[PDB]
Design an enzyme around this catalytic site. Structure first.
Site, PDB file in Angstrom:
ATOM      1  N   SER A   5       0.775  -1.227   0.000  1.00  0.00           N
ATOM      2  CA  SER A   5       0.000   0.000   0.000  1.00  0.00           C
ATOM      3  C   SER A   5       0.816   1.292   0.000  1.00  0.00           C
ATOM      4  O   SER A   5       1.997   1.309   0.304  1.00  0.00           O
ATOM      5  CB  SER A   5      -1.012   0.007   1.140  1.00  0.00           C
ATOM      6  OG  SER A   5      -0.470   0.612   2.279  1.00  0.00           O
ATOM      7  N   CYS A   6       0.137   2.370  -0.366  1.00  0.00           N
ATOM      8  CA  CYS A   6       0.683   3.712  -0.360  1.00  0.00           C
ATOM      9  C   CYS A   6       0.602   4.310   1.035  1.00  0.00           C
ATOM     10  O   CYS A   6       0.995   5.438   1.261  1.00  0.00           O
ATOM     11  CB  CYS A   6      -0.055   4.585  -1.359  1.00  0.00           C
ATOM     12  SG  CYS A   6       0.318   4.162  -3.067  1.00  0.00           S
ATOM     13  N   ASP A   7       0.029   3.552   1.951  1.00  0.00           N
ATOM     14  CA  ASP A   7       0.020   3.889   3.358  1.00  0.00           C
ATOM     15  C   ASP A   7       1.348   3.622   4.078  1.00  0.00           C
ATOM     16  O   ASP A   7       2.032   2.656   3.792  1.00  0.00           O
ATOM     17  CB  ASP A   7      -1.099   3.131   4.038  1.00  0.00           C
ATOM     18  CG  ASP A   7      -1.906   4.002   4.930  1.00  0.00           C
ATOM     19  OD1 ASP A   7      -1.304   4.655   5.803  1.00  0.00           O
ATOM     20  OD2 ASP A   7      -3.132   4.043   4.755  1.00  0.00           O
ATOM     21  N   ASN A  35      -7.005   0.933  -2.001  1.00  0.00           N
ATOM     22  CA  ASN A  35      -6.009   1.192  -3.025  1.00  0.00           C
ATOM     23  C   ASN A  35      -6.341   0.424  -4.291  1.00  0.00           C
ATOM     24  O   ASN A  35      -5.560   0.391  -5.203  1.00  0.00           O
ATOM     25  CB  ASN A  35      -4.593   0.863  -2.556  1.00  0.00           C
ATOM     26  CG  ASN A  35      -3.881   2.053  -1.946  1.00  0.00           C
ATOM     27  OD1 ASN A  35      -4.501   3.033  -1.590  1.00  0.00           O
ATOM     28  ND2 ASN A  35      -2.583   1.962  -1.816  1.00  0.00           N
TER      29      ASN A  35
END
Ligand SMILES: [Mg+2]
Ligand SMILES: [Mg+2]
Ligand SMILES: [Mg+2]
Ligand SMILES: [Mg+2]
Lengths: 369, 369
Positions: free
Chosen positions: B311-313, B350
């Site tokens: 993820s972009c988290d 996402n």
């Protein structure tokens, strides 16, 4: 330009014909958020970070407004693709990409990619030869290369046949301070000048997202954007600049309508069981560490109350010691600011359905307004 | 009876034809867990708490073994219904039920319900008149009525036309101690005797779940069950007794296969990016506060390493300071004990796909074993 908020009266009419839980999205508020950024931050093209909210009608609206999209996976590209959005309107802005994402990118003509590591280069070179790449810099753990590694990464990407296009950074804290954006802009300006001397000409700059949330929009937010914009026009007159708003675009355009399905009145503090919980839209309590204004419509005096979600889990507790009137089974409550990082992290745990997002502008309640 | 675990060799063959991430479920291990409980806790009928793992083939297997099911929502009933399971094989064991669940229960002939509050009675009376109800007692916040309120609740349910059938409790800590089960049994025995004097005859007792997890099964776990069983046979010779295993049934029957899709080698500690994360199967880190054995197949010396999800988290970090060999993009790792409260809490955040669960017994690798 107020935050979207259903009246007690609209909640009741909606819920008579739509079973709770459901979310209600205002396309007009989304458009207002978009035009506000256009008005006060004209220099920045918009890469909407759709991970925040991918509701098809919101995405169609943005695309017809001229928005581009920041996509993180094959799945997100596929969602957009079904709405007639082309890869020319996308940037694959996940620093570490998988095979499916790379194949979807090539299928849908996505030419713009971000990266932060030497390991990502060969994979992009093989998947999309000649593609445009922006290096993500850390101006401050998971993402971003050291500033002083940035141009060697772009050069290595150039060596592998990719096109060294630019730089992106993320500095949004959801603070009103422009200092961090302005500071980043000065760093970027220096790297752009150094790149020219290394046989690269960078053309695009992406300043990321994480803007402050709009007032339950306001002049202080407008002023911040104008100030960012002034520094962009000064520093980067001939560069294409971009922003990646996510939360900002929809957070304030969506509300949740949920019913009391149970009570427990034996404790000093009454408990209300809602039909949406921490495994659903309130998953943003877990992952986003966020808080959502709760509105109960009761007449009477109020006492500290607990609100719980519908799950068989103990962890499904939403609000504690919240001042609330006496509510009964069948009452509807209203949660605002429910547009970002809520529904997107919902699960089917316990077999519960995903609360659907209903478009306000398609409802009789909208015409009445 | 070992915990299910793919060999390095099987991981590689599977992954050549199945794109990662995927989960692999062993129906034989599920069956072994079921028969073990049958062998050592014969008195208890099984209500499988399907919320833990609802994989259709696991559910079909259990149903053909004679298992019943603890269901929490319309959705869970619908899953079972599609596999030919009838409501006579279910208990709707969510203390606070919604309209859809109540309608599904009536559609699929579910006659057994649990409750813990006066507010739940009228709703059940209208939805399923005459249904069998078990009161859930707290023997120890979200669920369970005070012990000394239990029989008044059953009486009120009887007043509203429902059938006061029994009692259930939850005391499983995943400790080997039988003391808490045995203790609860003595409380239940007292309430059953008091009920006879109030014009009720209770017939069913549900002792809940939360058994200790089986050894990477063992004799100490067998001994605990035998001891519970001995107290059940002593205290409740003529009562139908039930248990609600969830984690116990499948936790040790499933593994996750995930690929390294990126590395970061610039820090002292190398970082590996996997193609499944905290928004997927590892959501159990967030909601279940659980830890999953990670197996890397590398030859060489190992150093403290971080594993991150795709993820972009920033929050998508799985393991820190984990001793691991040098891994490369394309390497597969293996996570065991991935059968319970992992996949069930996965999201499409996402745009990532839900990792599918593949049945081992349907694969060439199974025959080879
Ligand atoms: Mg934002
Ligand atoms: Mg310029
Ligand atoms: Mg269990
Ligand atoms: Mg008996």
């Amino acid at each position: 330009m107020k935050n979207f908020r259903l009246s007690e009266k609209e909640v009741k009419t909606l819920a008579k014909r739509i079973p709770t839980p459901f979310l209600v999205a205002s396309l007009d508020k989304v458009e207002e958020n978009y035009q506000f950024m256009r008005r006060h931050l004209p220099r920045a093209g918009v890469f909407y970070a759709m991970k925040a909210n991918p509701t098809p009608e919101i995405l169609s609206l943005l695309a017809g407004l001229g928005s581009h999209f920041d996509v993180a996976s094959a799945g997100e590209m596929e969602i957009l693709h079904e709405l007639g959005v082309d890869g020319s309107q996308m940037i694959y802005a996940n620093p570490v990409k998988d095979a499916r994402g790379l194949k979807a990118a090539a299928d849908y003509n996505v030419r713009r990619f971000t990266f932060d590591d030497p390991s990502e280069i060969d994979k992009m070179a093989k998947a999309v030869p000649g593609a445009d790449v922006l290096v993500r810099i850390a101006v401050r753990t998971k993402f971003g290369a050291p500033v002083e590694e940035a141009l060697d990464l772009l050069k290595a990407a150039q060596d592998a046949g990719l096109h060294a296009m630019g730089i992106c950074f993320h500095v949004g804290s959801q603070s009103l301070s422009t200092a961090a954006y302005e500071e980043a802009l000065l760093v970027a300006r220096r790297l752009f000048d150094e790149a020219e001397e290394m046989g690269m000409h960078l053309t695009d700059l992406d300043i990321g997202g994480g803007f402050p949330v709009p007032d339950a929009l306001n002049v202080d937010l407008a002023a911040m954007m104008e100030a960012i914009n002034k520094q962009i026009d000064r520093l980067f007159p001939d560069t294409a600049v971009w922003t990646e708003p996510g939360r900002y675009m929809c957070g304030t355009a969506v509300n949740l309508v949920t019913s009391v399905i149970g009570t427990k009145t034996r404790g000093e503090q009454p408990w209300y069981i809602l039909d949406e919980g921490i495994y659903g839209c309130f998953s943003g309590i877990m992952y986003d560490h966020w808080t959502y204004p709760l509105h109960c419509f009761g007449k009477g005096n109020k006492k500290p109350s607990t609100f719980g979600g519908p799950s068989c889990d103990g962890i499904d507790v939403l609000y504690r010691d919240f001042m609330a009137p006496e509510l009964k089974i069948g009452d509807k409550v209203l949660v605002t600011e429910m547009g970002s990082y809520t529904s997107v992290s919902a699960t089917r745990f316990n077999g519960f359905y995903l609360a659907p997002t209903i478009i306000f502008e398609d409802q009789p309640e909208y015409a009445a307004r």
